[PDB]
Copies of this chain bind each other. A is one copy, B any other.
Amino acid sequence: HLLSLTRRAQKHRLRDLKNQVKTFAEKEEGGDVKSVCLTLFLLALRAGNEHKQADELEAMMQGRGFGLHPAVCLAIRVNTFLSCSQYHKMYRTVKATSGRQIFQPLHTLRNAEKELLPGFHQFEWQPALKNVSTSWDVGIIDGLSGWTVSVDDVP
């Protein structure tokens, strides 16, 4: 079996096959040796339904994503109701195993949405709004809106 054989035995077992493939590739594609034998693999695997093999091979070759945009992750975390600490646990656990780190750490989520949250973009009005302050970078304010806290009054 040419699977567990050394390099140069598979070499001279398949010299004629690789010669025929290189000749055909030079005949039709200018000579790109790699892309032909890569699609040979494409179709050879997709014959038996193991589409999973084909995906991970198109995963390696100029892959889209080792990793995810940090926004997609922040979104993942908030949309799976993940505790911050649990997600961090997961991040450490999924990074230590086969991790090139994929998920972003937590502290990069915290500055990632400073764009998603309110009070960020600059804006204005004309004519200037009435009875509304013009400061535009005010984030989350508690709604009491200036309650004159002394006790004896309406509390």
Binding site for B on A (CB under 8 A): 1-3, 7, 10-11, 13-14, 16-18, 20-21, 24, 28-30, 32-46, 52-53, 55-57, 59-61, 63-69, 72, 75-76, 79-83, 86-87, 89-90, 93-94, 97-102
Contact = CB atoms under 8 A, between A and B. Distances in A.
Number of copies: 2
A82 to B, nearest CB: 7
B14 A43 contact: yes
B40 A28 contact: no
Given A56-B60, A61-B53, A99-B65, A43 B2 contact: no
A44 to B, nearest CB: 5
Nearest to A50: B34
